[PDB]
Amino acid sequence: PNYKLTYFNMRGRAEIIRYIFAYLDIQYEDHRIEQADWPEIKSTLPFGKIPILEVDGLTLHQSLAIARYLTKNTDLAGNTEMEQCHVDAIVDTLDDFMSCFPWAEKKQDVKEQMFNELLTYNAPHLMQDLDTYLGGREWLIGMSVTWADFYWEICSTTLLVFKPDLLDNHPRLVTLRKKVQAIPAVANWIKRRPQTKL
Amino acid sequence: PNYKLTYFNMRGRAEIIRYIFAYLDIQYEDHRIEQADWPEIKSTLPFGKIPILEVDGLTLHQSLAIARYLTKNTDLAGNTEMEQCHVDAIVDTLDDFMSCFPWAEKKQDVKEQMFNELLTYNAPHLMQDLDTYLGGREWLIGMSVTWADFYWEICSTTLLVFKPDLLDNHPRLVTLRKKVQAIPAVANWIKRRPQTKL
Ligand SMILES: O=c1[nH][nH]c(=O)c2cc(-[n+]3nc(/C=C/c4ccccc4)nn3-c3nc4ccccc4s3)ccc12
Ligand SMILES: O=c1[nH][nH]c(=O)c2cc(-[n+]3nc(/C=C/c4ccccc4)nn3-c3nc4ccccc4s3)ccc12
Ligand SMILES: N[C@@H](CCC(=O)N[C@@H](CS)C(=O)NCC(=O)O)C(=O)O
Ligand SMILES: N[C@@H](CCC(=O)N[C@@H](CS)C(=O)NCC(=O)O)C(=O)O
Ligand SMILES: [Mg+2]
């Protein structure tokens, strides 16, 4: 199939998709648009949002819906119907927290203030829940890597930018990040991808 | 399997699961708790959130992850992987919007302020996009009902409570709502379900 992923030049909400393509060794057009080119594109979209993934002429939207589609029938989806549910559940739990941040707030002072508050008063509870959930296991779900692990690594990479000590109390979550980063295909993408703040 | 759904005594985020169980004709325990029950309960939850679904003692969380789990391999899932992606996308677009509302904000007005903005400006645009997306088609995805249609009817029901004229200019979305409500198993549920504001 011919794939074309459209998003801004940043990891953001499209990174999970890029990790999946890398892991699966699938070629695709990583189309990164400049802010100025967004308006004319937005008007042609279903619900005016990106990322979107074009597959043989048809358009798909919603980052997680796309990610799930790409992992279907692969080892990244989950090893049992119930584990597949757990993968989806961990992914939404992580996405729910990421969606709490005022990424679009114009006023920098209020934005920064809210970021710091969420990272100091709210994040600790989620990190603990995740640590407890992971326990002494190697991966978040099952006994092999799933895209939920990829998502943890992607989300935490961004949160760590704003809160360096985020995982100082949870070395097990740090270990998981490193394990994902060590997967050859993932390590390679991480090394070659455009370096952007977000 | 023994199914036990735990949530507040309201439709909310659990209604989609309730609709699925009804449609598929699956018996389950519809456990509804009151606020005075939450505290002790929350302490016993993976990520302190409801709804949760217990399957033979095993706890599953995240409403959409659970909803997807129950509809896999059924006629509500989507007929192709691509269509399954569209179902997931439509559901997340709707969930994204519903999640924007400050349901928990404590101040009667600061809350009503964000609500007004969401209902007066954001809502109309989403309705337009959805209406355009549906076109003259019978259901949102494919040629048969899917849980995405279920979600549309559920989400729109709550939105209508705050903005009665939401669908005045989109009769096609109203027709879809009625189609879902006319499905025997669903109609029976809508008839017998506890009457709650949300
Ligand atoms: O409301 C917005 N308007 N315009 C935006 O560009 C924008 C960006 C935005 N961002 N989201 C994210 C990542 C989200 C995420 C969610 C789940 C998992 C992983 C990631 N990043 N991000 C932005 N970053 C930057 C950096 C520099 C300058 C501007 C931006 S936006 C959210 C909302 C909006
Ligand atoms: O912060 C909260 N804590 N506990 C809660 O139970 C809770 C519920 C809540 N609410 N969510 C919804 C509906 C969500 C929805 C999402 C997708 C599709 C359709 C629906 N309603 N809701 C509440 N409603 C009321 C009404 C009166 C008094 C209190 C509440 S909570 C939001 C936050 C929380
Ligand atoms: N939940 C959606 C979020 C879609 C979304 O809001 N995308 C933002 C960028 S991360 C966007 O399109 N912003 C431009 C706009 O809203 O005009 C997903 O994961 O795809
Ligand atoms: N995205 C989650 C939302 C989970 C959530 O926030 N649930 C609320 C009820 S609507 C809750 O448990 N609130 C109590 C709390 O957060 O302490 C889902 O759909 O399951
Ligand atoms: Mg979501």
Short mmCIF file of C-alpha atoms and ligand atoms in Angstrom, two decimals:
data_model
loop_
_atom_site.label_atom_id
_atom_site.label_comp_id
_atom_site.label_asym_id
_atom_site.label_seq_id
_atom_site.Cartn_x
_atom_site.Cartn_y
_atom_site.Cartn_z
CA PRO A 1 0.00 0.00 0.00
CA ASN A 2 1.15 3.58 -0.54
CA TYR A 3 1.26 5.61 2.67
CA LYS A 4 1.52 9.36 3.23
CA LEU A 5 1.55 10.72 6.78
CA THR A 6 0.80 14.43 7.18
CA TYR A 7 1.71 16.35 10.32
CA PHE A 8 3.79 19.32 11.45
CA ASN A 9 7.55 19.03 11.67
CA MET A 10 7.55 17.71 15.21
CA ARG A 11 7.15 14.40 17.02
CA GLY A 12 3.85 15.34 18.63
CA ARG A 13 0.79 13.18 18.00
CA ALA A 14 2.23 11.61 14.85
CA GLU A 15 5.32 10.09 16.47
CA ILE A 16 3.53 6.92 17.57
CA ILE A 17 2.69 6.29 13.94
CA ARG A 18 6.30 6.91 12.89
CA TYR A 19 7.55 4.44 15.52
CA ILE A 20 5.18 1.78 14.22
CA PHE A 21 6.29 2.22 10.60
CA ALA A 22 9.92 1.98 11.74
CA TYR A 23 9.42 -1.12 13.87
CA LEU A 24 7.52 -2.86 11.10
CA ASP A 25 10.05 -1.80 8.45
CA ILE A 26 7.32 -0.17 6.33
CA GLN A 27 8.08 2.60 3.85
CA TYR A 28 5.93 5.74 3.87
CA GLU A 29 6.00 9.42 2.96
CA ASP A 30 6.74 11.35 6.17
CA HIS A 31 5.15 14.62 5.02
CA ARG A 32 5.97 17.46 7.43
CA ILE A 33 4.18 20.75 6.83
CA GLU A 34 5.19 24.28 7.80
CA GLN A 35 2.75 26.29 9.91
CA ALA A 36 2.02 28.59 6.95
CA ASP A 37 0.95 25.61 4.83
CA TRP A 38 -1.57 24.43 7.43
CA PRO A 39 -4.52 26.73 6.57
CA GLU A 40 -4.98 25.58 2.95
CA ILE A 41 -4.56 21.96 4.07
CA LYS A 42 -6.94 22.18 7.04
CA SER A 43 -9.86 23.19 4.79
CA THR A 44 -9.56 19.94 2.84
CA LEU A 45 -9.61 17.72 5.93
CA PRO A 46 -12.58 15.81 7.46
CA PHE A 47 -12.49 17.37 10.89
CA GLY A 48 -9.76 19.93 10.31
CA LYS A 49 -7.10 18.10 12.29
CA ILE A 50 -3.85 16.22 11.78
CA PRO A 51 -2.18 13.79 11.78
CA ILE A 52 -3.88 12.11 8.84
CA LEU A 53 -2.64 9.08 6.93
CA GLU A 54 -3.48 8.56 3.28
CA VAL A 55 -3.61 4.91 2.25
CA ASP A 56 -4.00 4.17 -1.46
CA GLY A 57 -6.01 7.34 -2.02
CA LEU A 58 -8.19 7.15 1.11
CA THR A 59 -7.76 9.39 4.16
CA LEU A 60 -7.57 8.21 7.77
CA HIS A 61 -7.56 10.47 10.82
CA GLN A 62 -7.07 10.36 14.61
CA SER A 63 -3.55 9.39 15.65
CA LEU A 64 -4.51 6.46 17.89
CA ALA A 65 -7.09 5.09 15.46
CA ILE A 66 -4.36 5.08 12.79
CA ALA A 67 -1.76 3.57 15.11
CA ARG A 68 -4.14 0.75 16.01
CA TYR A 69 -4.89 0.13 12.33
CA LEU A 70 -1.18 -0.17 11.50
CA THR A 71 -0.58 -2.65 14.32
CA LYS A 72 -3.48 -4.97 13.46
CA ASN A 73 -2.26 -8.50 12.74
CA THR A 74 1.21 -7.70 14.10
CA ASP A 75 3.10 -8.49 17.30
CA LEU A 76 2.66 -4.89 18.52
CA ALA A 77 -1.12 -5.13 18.95
CA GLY A 78 -1.31 -7.48 21.93
CA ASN A 79 -1.06 -11.26 22.34
CA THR A 80 -4.64 -11.99 23.49
CA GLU A 81 -7.99 -10.25 23.08
CA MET A 82 -7.82 -9.09 26.68
CA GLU A 83 -4.22 -7.90 26.40
CA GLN A 84 -5.23 -5.98 23.27
CA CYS A 85 -7.82 -4.27 25.47
CA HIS A 86 -5.12 -3.47 28.05
CA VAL A 87 -2.93 -1.98 25.32
CA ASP A 88 -5.80 0.28 24.22
CA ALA A 89 -6.56 1.15 27.83
CA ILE A 90 -2.99 2.17 28.72
CA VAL A 91 -2.75 4.19 25.51
CA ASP A 92 -5.95 6.15 26.27
CA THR A 93 -4.87 6.69 29.89
CA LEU A 94 -1.62 8.24 28.64
CA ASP A 95 -3.38 10.26 25.92
CA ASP A 96 -5.97 11.54 28.42
CA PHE A 97 -3.19 13.04 30.54
CA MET A 98 -1.34 14.51 27.55
CA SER A 99 -4.60 16.14 26.42
CA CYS A 100 -4.74 18.01 29.75
CA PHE A 101 -1.85 20.28 28.78
CA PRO A 102 -2.72 23.67 27.21
CA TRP A 103 -0.48 23.12 24.17
CA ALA A 104 -2.30 25.90 22.28
CA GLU A 105 -2.39 28.55 25.04
CA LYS A 106 -1.23 31.87 23.55
CA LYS A 107 -0.34 33.51 26.87
CA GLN A 108 3.04 32.04 27.80
CA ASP A 109 2.85 32.85 31.51
CA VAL A 110 -0.48 31.10 32.06
CA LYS A 111 0.60 28.19 29.87
CA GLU A 112 3.85 27.66 31.75
CA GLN A 113 2.03 27.99 35.08
CA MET A 114 -0.51 25.30 34.16
CA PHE A 115 2.22 23.03 32.78
CA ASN A 116 4.16 23.27 36.05
CA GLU A 117 1.04 22.63 38.11
CA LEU A 118 0.02 19.55 36.11
CA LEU A 119 3.57 18.20 36.28
CA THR A 120 3.91 18.80 40.01
CA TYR A 121 0.46 18.01 41.40
CA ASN A 122 -1.04 15.64 38.84
CA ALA A 123 1.72 13.69 37.08
CA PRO A 124 3.09 12.05 40.28
CA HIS A 125 -0.17 10.14 40.72
CA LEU A 126 -0.15 8.83 37.16
CA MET A 127 3.51 7.88 37.33
CA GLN A 128 2.85 5.89 40.50
CA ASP A 129 -0.20 4.19 38.98
CA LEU A 130 1.88 3.24 35.93
CA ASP A 131 4.79 2.00 38.06
CA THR A 132 2.44 -0.12 40.16
CA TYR A 133 0.72 -1.39 37.00
CA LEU A 134 4.06 -2.35 35.43
CA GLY A 135 5.38 -3.97 38.60
CA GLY A 136 8.44 -6.12 38.03
CA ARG A 137 7.35 -7.01 34.49
CA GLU A 138 9.48 -6.32 31.42
CA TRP A 139 6.77 -4.59 29.37
CA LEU A 140 3.50 -2.83 30.23
CA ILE A 141 1.37 -5.54 28.64
CA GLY A 142 2.12 -9.23 28.24
CA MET A 143 5.66 -10.52 27.88
CA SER A 144 6.59 -8.76 24.65
CA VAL A 145 6.69 -5.15 23.43
CA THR A 146 3.42 -3.54 22.28
CA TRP A 147 2.72 -0.08 20.93
CA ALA A 148 1.60 0.89 24.44
CA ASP A 149 5.29 0.70 25.41
CA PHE A 150 6.12 2.89 22.41
CA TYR A 151 3.51 5.39 23.55
CA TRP A 152 4.87 5.48 27.08
CA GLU A 153 8.34 6.23 25.72
CA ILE A 154 7.01 8.92 23.39
CA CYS A 155 4.82 10.66 25.97
CA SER A 156 7.47 10.54 28.71
CA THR A 157 10.12 11.90 26.34
CA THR A 158 8.02 15.03 25.94
CA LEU A 159 6.98 15.34 29.58
CA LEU A 160 10.64 15.02 30.61
CA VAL A 161 11.37 18.15 28.60
CA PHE A 162 9.20 20.16 30.98
CA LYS A 163 9.80 18.14 34.14
CA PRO A 164 13.31 16.60 34.26
CA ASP A 165 12.76 14.86 37.62
CA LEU A 166 9.49 13.30 36.44
CA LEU A 167 10.79 9.73 36.82
CA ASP A 168 13.36 10.17 39.61
CA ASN A 169 11.14 8.09 41.94
CA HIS A 170 10.37 5.46 39.31
CA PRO A 171 13.53 3.81 37.93
CA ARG A 172 11.42 0.95 36.57
CA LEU A 173 9.64 3.31 34.18
CA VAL A 174 13.06 4.63 33.15
CA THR A 175 14.20 1.09 32.45
CA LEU A 176 11.16 0.56 30.22
CA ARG A 177 11.98 3.74 28.27
CA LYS A 178 15.54 2.50 27.67
CA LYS A 179 14.33 -0.93 26.55
CA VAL A 180 12.08 0.65 23.94
CA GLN A 181 14.89 2.97 22.87
CA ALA A 182 17.24 -0.03 22.54
CA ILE A 183 15.06 -1.88 20.00
CA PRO A 184 17.28 -1.58 16.88
CA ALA A 185 14.59 -0.32 14.48
CA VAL A 186 13.41 2.16 17.09
CA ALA A 187 16.90 3.29 18.06
CA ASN A 188 17.61 3.92 14.38
CA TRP A 189 14.51 6.08 13.88
CA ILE A 190 15.23 7.99 17.07
CA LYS A 191 18.77 8.68 15.84
CA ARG A 192 17.81 9.84 12.34
CA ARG A 193 14.53 11.67 12.92
CA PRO A 194 14.40 15.48 12.67
CA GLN A 195 15.40 16.89 16.06
CA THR A 196 12.51 19.07 17.25
CA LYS A 197 11.58 20.34 20.71
CA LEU A 198 8.12 18.74 20.65
CA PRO B 1 -18.14 -14.96 31.27
CA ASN B 2 -19.48 -13.03 34.27
CA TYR B 3 -19.66 -9.32 33.39
CA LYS B 4 -19.83 -6.59 36.04
CA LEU B 5 -19.89 -2.95 34.91
CA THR B 6 -19.13 -0.34 37.56
CA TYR B 7 -19.94 3.34 37.07
CA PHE B 8 -21.96 6.22 38.51
CA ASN B 9 -25.75 6.14 38.24
CA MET B 10 -25.73 8.12 34.99
CA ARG B 11 -25.32 7.31 31.30
CA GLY B 12 -22.03 9.15 30.88
CA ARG B 13 -19.00 7.22 29.67
CA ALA B 14 -20.47 3.81 30.50
CA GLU B 15 -23.62 4.06 28.37
CA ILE B 16 -21.74 2.99 25.24
CA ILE B 17 -20.86 -0.28 26.98
CA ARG B 18 -24.44 -0.68 28.16
CA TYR B 19 -25.69 -0.22 24.57
CA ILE B 20 -23.25 -2.85 23.30
CA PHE B 21 -24.31 -5.39 25.92
CA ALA B 22 -27.97 -4.77 25.06
CA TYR B 23 -27.44 -5.03 21.30
CA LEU B 24 -25.45 -8.25 21.64
CA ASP B 25 -28.00 -9.50 24.18
CA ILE B 26 -25.39 -10.10 26.88
CA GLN B 27 -26.40 -10.26 30.54
CA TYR B 28 -24.22 -8.27 32.93
CA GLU B 29 -24.37 -6.64 36.35
CA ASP B 30 -25.01 -2.91 35.88
CA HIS B 31 -23.38 -1.80 39.13
CA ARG B 32 -24.07 1.87 39.82
CA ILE B 33 -22.38 3.59 42.75
CA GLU B 34 -23.15 6.85 44.53
CA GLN B 35 -20.60 9.54 45.38
CA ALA B 36 -20.42 8.28 48.97
CA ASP B 37 -19.17 4.97 47.57
CA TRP B 38 -16.50 6.29 45.20
CA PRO B 39 -13.67 7.02 47.71
CA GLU B 40 -13.20 3.44 48.94
CA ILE B 41 -13.80 2.15 45.41
CA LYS B 42 -11.32 4.45 43.65
CA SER B 43 -8.58 3.16 45.94
CA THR B 44 -9.14 -0.27 44.39
CA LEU B 45 -8.88 0.83 40.77
CA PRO B 46 -5.89 0.61 38.36
CA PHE B 47 -5.85 4.29 37.50
CA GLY B 48 -8.58 5.50 39.86
CA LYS B 49 -11.16 5.97 37.14
CA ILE B 50 -14.49 4.50 36.12
CA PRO B 51 -16.09 2.92 34.20
CA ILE B 52 -14.37 -0.42 34.72
CA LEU B 53 -15.57 -3.82 33.52
CA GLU B 54 -14.86 -7.00 35.43
CA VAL B 55 -14.71 -10.15 33.33
CA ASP B 56 -14.73 -13.23 35.55
CA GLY B 57 -12.92 -11.24 38.22
CA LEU B 58 -10.42 -9.58 35.86
CA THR B 59 -10.55 -5.78 35.76
CA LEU B 60 -10.59 -3.92 32.44
CA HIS B 61 -10.63 -0.10 32.27
CA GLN B 62 -11.12 2.81 29.83
CA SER B 63 -14.61 2.96 28.30
CA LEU B 64 -13.54 2.97 24.66
CA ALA B 65 -10.95 0.23 25.13
CA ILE B 66 -13.70 -1.86 26.75
CA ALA B 67 -16.25 -0.94 24.07
CA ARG B 68 -13.79 -2.00 21.35
CA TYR B 69 -13.03 -5.21 23.21
CA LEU B 70 -16.70 -6.21 23.33
CA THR B 71 -17.42 -5.40 19.68
CA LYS B 72 -14.49 -7.22 18.12
CA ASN B 73 -15.60 -10.14 15.99
CA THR B 74 -19.18 -8.80 16.03
CA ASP B 75 -21.24 -6.97 13.40
CA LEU B 76 -20.67 -3.66 15.21
CA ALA B 77 -16.91 -3.53 14.54
CA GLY B 78 -16.61 -2.47 10.90
CA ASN B 79 -16.37 -4.76 7.87
CA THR B 80 -12.72 -4.13 6.96
CA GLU B 81 -9.67 -3.00 8.89
CA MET B 82 -9.90 0.37 7.17
CA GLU B 83 -13.55 0.72 8.22
CA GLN B 84 -12.61 -0.34 11.74
CA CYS B 85 -10.17 2.54 11.66
CA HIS B 86 -12.94 4.95 10.63
CA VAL B 87 -15.11 3.66 13.46
CA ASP B 88 -12.29 4.32 15.94
CA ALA B 89 -11.60 7.74 14.41
CA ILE B 90 -15.22 8.91 14.60
CA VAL B 91 -15.47 7.67 18.18
CA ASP B 92 -12.28 9.51 19.24
CA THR B 93 -13.38 12.73 17.52
CA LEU B 94 -16.63 12.58 19.48
CA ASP B 95 -14.85 11.61 22.72
CA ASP B 96 -12.30 14.41 22.22
CA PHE B 97 -15.15 16.94 22.12
CA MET B 98 -17.17 15.51 25.02
CA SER B 99 -13.94 15.40 27.04
CA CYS B 100 -13.44 19.14 26.46
CA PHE B 101 -16.31 19.95 28.81
CA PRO B 102 -15.26 20.82 32.39
CA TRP B 103 -17.71 18.37 33.98
CA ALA B 104 -15.72 18.53 37.22
CA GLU B 105 -15.15 22.29 37.48
CA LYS B 106 -16.57 23.37 40.85
CA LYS B 107 -17.65 26.97 40.14
CA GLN B 108 -21.17 27.23 38.69
CA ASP B 109 -20.23 30.07 36.33
CA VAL B 110 -16.56 29.62 35.35
CA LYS B 111 -17.84 26.19 34.33
CA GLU B 112 -20.85 27.61 32.52
CA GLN B 113 -18.46 29.95 30.73
CA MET B 114 -16.40 27.18 29.14
CA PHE B 115 -19.65 25.34 28.44
CA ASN B 116 -21.20 28.25 26.54
CA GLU B 117 -18.11 28.69 24.36
CA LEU B 118 -18.06 24.97 23.57
CA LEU B 119 -21.78 24.84 22.75
CA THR B 120 -22.06 28.18 20.96
CA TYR B 121 -18.99 27.98 18.71
CA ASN B 122 -17.23 24.61 18.78
CA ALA B 123 -20.34 22.40 18.73
CA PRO B 124 -21.88 23.89 15.55
CA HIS B 125 -18.66 23.31 13.61
CA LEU B 126 -18.37 19.70 14.74
CA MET B 127 -22.01 19.10 13.83
CA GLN B 128 -21.30 20.53 10.38
CA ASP B 129 -18.27 18.29 9.89
CA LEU B 130 -20.15 15.23 11.10
CA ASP B 131 -23.09 16.05 8.85
CA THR B 132 -20.75 16.47 5.89
CA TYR B 133 -18.97 13.24 6.81
CA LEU B 134 -22.24 11.27 6.93
CA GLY B 135 -23.42 12.69 3.62
CA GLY B 136 -26.56 10.97 2.39
CA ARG B 137 -25.35 7.67 3.81
CA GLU B 138 -27.45 5.52 6.15
CA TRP B 139 -24.82 4.95 8.86
CA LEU B 140 -21.57 6.75 9.75
CA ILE B 141 -19.33 3.90 8.59
CA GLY B 142 -20.09 1.27 5.96
CA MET B 143 -23.56 0.05 5.05
CA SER B 144 -24.54 -1.32 8.46
CA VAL B 145 -24.67 0.02 12.01
CA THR B 146 -21.46 0.07 14.08
CA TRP B 147 -20.80 1.21 17.63
CA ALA B 148 -19.76 4.56 16.17
CA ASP B 149 -23.43 5.24 15.40
CA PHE B 150 -24.19 4.14 18.96
CA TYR B 151 -21.65 6.65 20.27
CA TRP B 152 -23.07 9.43 18.09
CA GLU B 153 -26.56 8.91 19.50
CA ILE B 154 -25.22 8.75 23.06
CA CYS B 155 -23.02 11.86 22.78
CA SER B 156 -25.70 13.86 20.95
CA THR B 157 -28.28 12.93 23.60
CA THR B 158 -26.23 14.61 26.31
CA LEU B 159 -25.36 17.60 24.12
CA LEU B 160 -29.05 18.14 23.36
CA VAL B 161 -29.70 18.49 27.09
CA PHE B 162 -27.62 21.68 27.16
CA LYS B 163 -28.24 22.85 23.60
CA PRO B 164 -31.71 21.76 22.34
CA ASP B 165 -31.24 23.44 18.94
CA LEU B 166 -27.92 21.69 18.25
CA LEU B 167 -29.41 19.66 15.38
CA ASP B 168 -31.99 22.09 13.97
CA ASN B 169 -29.87 22.55 10.85
CA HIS B 170 -28.77 18.94 10.51
CA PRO B 171 -31.85 16.72 10.01
CA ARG B 172 -29.67 13.94 8.61
CA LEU B 173 -27.88 13.59 11.96
CA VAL B 174 -31.28 13.53 13.66
CA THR B 175 -32.42 10.78 11.30
CA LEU B 176 -29.34 8.78 12.25
CA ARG B 177 -30.15 9.26 15.95
CA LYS B 178 -33.63 7.85 15.38
CA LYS B 179 -32.30 4.91 13.38
CA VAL B 180 -30.14 3.89 16.33
CA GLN B 181 -33.01 4.43 18.76
CA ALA B 182 -35.29 2.29 16.55
CA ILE B 183 -33.02 -0.75 16.80
CA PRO B 184 -35.10 -3.24 18.89
CA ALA B 185 -32.44 -4.16 21.45
CA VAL B 186 -31.44 -0.51 21.87
CA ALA B 187 -35.03 0.77 22.02
CA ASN B 188 -35.73 -1.77 24.73
CA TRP B 189 -32.73 -0.48 26.67
CA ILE B 190 -33.60 3.18 26.24
CA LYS B 191 -37.05 2.28 27.55
CA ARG B 192 -36.01 0.40 30.69
CA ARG B 193 -32.83 2.29 31.61
CA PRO B 194 -32.77 4.51 34.72
CA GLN B 195 -33.72 8.10 33.90
CA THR B 196 -30.85 10.43 34.69
CA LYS B 197 -29.86 13.91 33.53
CA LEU B 198 -26.52 12.80 32.09
O1 LIG C 1 -4.10 24.30 19.82
C1 LIG C 1 -3.07 24.18 19.18
N1 LIG C 1 -2.82 25.00 18.14
N2 LIG C 1 -1.65 24.90 17.39
C2 LIG C 1 -0.71 23.98 17.65
O2 LIG C 1 0.30 23.91 16.97
C3 LIG C 1 -0.91 23.04 18.78
C4 LIG C 1 0.03 22.07 19.09
C5 LIG C 1 -0.20 21.20 20.16
N3 LIG C 1 0.74 20.24 20.48
N4 LIG C 1 0.50 19.02 20.79
C6 LIG C 1 1.63 18.36 21.04
C7 LIG C 1 1.72 16.94 21.43
C8 LIG C 1 0.63 16.30 21.88
C9 LIG C 1 0.72 14.88 22.26
C10 LIG C 1 -0.40 14.21 22.73
C11 LIG C 1 -0.32 12.88 23.10
C12 LIG C 1 0.89 12.22 22.99
C13 LIG C 1 2.01 12.87 22.52
C14 LIG C 1 1.93 14.20 22.15
N5 LIG C 1 2.66 19.17 20.88
N6 LIG C 1 2.13 20.42 20.50
C15 LIG C 1 2.83 21.58 20.23
N7 LIG C 1 4.12 21.82 20.37
C16 LIG C 1 4.68 23.01 20.06
C17 LIG C 1 6.04 23.39 20.16
C18 LIG C 1 6.44 24.65 19.80
C19 LIG C 1 5.54 25.60 19.33
C20 LIG C 1 4.21 25.26 19.22
C21 LIG C 1 3.79 24.00 19.58
S1 LIG C 1 2.23 23.14 19.59
C22 LIG C 1 -1.37 21.31 20.91
C23 LIG C 1 -2.30 22.27 20.61
C24 LIG C 1 -2.08 23.14 19.55
O1 LIG C 2 -14.32 14.65 37.96
C1 LIG C 2 -15.13 13.76 37.95
N1 LIG C 2 -15.13 12.83 38.93
N2 LIG C 2 -16.06 11.79 38.95
C2 LIG C 2 -17.01 11.65 38.01
O2 LIG C 2 -17.80 10.73 38.06
C3 LIG C 2 -17.08 12.63 36.90
C4 LIG C 2 -18.04 12.53 35.91
C5 LIG C 2 -18.07 13.48 34.88
N3 LIG C 2 -19.02 13.39 33.90
N4 LIG C 2 -18.87 12.87 32.73
C6 LIG C 2 -19.99 12.95 32.02
C7 LIG C 2 -20.17 12.45 30.64
C8 LIG C 2 -19.09 12.18 29.89
C9 LIG C 2 -19.27 11.68 28.51
C10 LIG C 2 -18.16 11.40 27.72
C11 LIG C 2 -18.32 10.94 26.43
C12 LIG C 2 -19.60 10.76 25.93
C13 LIG C 2 -20.71 11.03 26.70
C14 LIG C 2 -20.55 11.49 28.00
N5 LIG C 2 -20.93 13.53 32.74
N6 LIG C 2 -20.35 13.84 33.99
C15 LIG C 2 -20.96 14.46 35.07
N7 LIG C 2 -22.14 15.01 35.15
C16 LIG C 2 -22.61 15.58 36.27
C17 LIG C 2 -23.87 16.20 36.48
C18 LIG C 2 -24.18 16.74 37.70
C19 LIG C 2 -23.30 16.70 38.77
C20 LIG C 2 -22.06 16.11 38.59
C21 LIG C 2 -21.73 15.57 37.38
S1 LIG C 2 -20.31 14.72 36.72
C22 LIG C 2 -17.14 14.52 34.86
C23 LIG C 2 -16.18 14.62 35.85
C24 LIG C 2 -16.15 13.69 36.88
N1 LIG C 3 -7.07 13.39 19.29
C1 LIG C 3 -6.56 13.82 17.99
C2 LIG C 3 -6.07 15.29 18.10
C3 LIG C 3 -6.12 16.04 16.74
C4 LIG C 3 -5.63 17.50 16.94
O1 LIG C 3 -6.25 18.28 17.69
N2 LIG C 3 -4.51 17.82 16.24
C5 LIG C 3 -3.93 19.18 16.33
C6 LIG C 3 -2.38 19.11 16.28
S1 LIG C 3 -1.67 17.97 17.49
C7 LIG C 3 -4.39 20.04 15.12
O2 LIG C 3 -4.84 19.54 14.08
N3 LIG C 3 -4.25 21.39 15.27
C8 LIG C 3 -4.59 22.40 14.24
C9 LIG C 3 -6.02 22.88 14.35
O3 LIG C 3 -6.76 22.41 15.24
O4 LIG C 3 -6.36 23.74 13.51
C10 LIG C 3 -5.44 12.90 17.44
O5 LIG C 3 -4.79 12.22 18.24
O6 LIG C 3 -5.25 12.89 16.14
N1 LIG C 4 -11.13 8.50 29.19
C1 LIG C 4 -11.66 7.76 30.33
C2 LIG C 4 -12.22 8.75 31.38
C3 LIG C 4 -12.10 8.19 32.82
C4 LIG C 4 -12.68 9.23 33.81
O1 LIG C 4 -12.16 10.36 33.92
N2 LIG C 4 -13.76 8.81 34.51
C5 LIG C 4 -14.41 9.69 35.48
C6 LIG C 4 -15.95 9.50 35.42
S1 LIG C 4 -16.68 10.25 33.93
C7 LIG C 4 -13.94 9.35 36.91
O2 LIG C 4 -13.64 8.19 37.25
N3 LIG C 4 -13.88 10.40 37.79
C8 LIG C 4 -13.47 10.26 39.20
C9 LIG C 4 -12.02 10.68 39.39
O3 LIG C 4 -11.36 11.07 38.39
O4 LIG C 4 -11.57 10.61 40.55
C10 LIG C 4 -12.76 6.73 29.93
O5 LIG C 4 -13.47 6.97 28.94
O6 LIG C 4 -12.88 5.66 30.67
MG MG C 5 -9.10 9.68 23.64
#
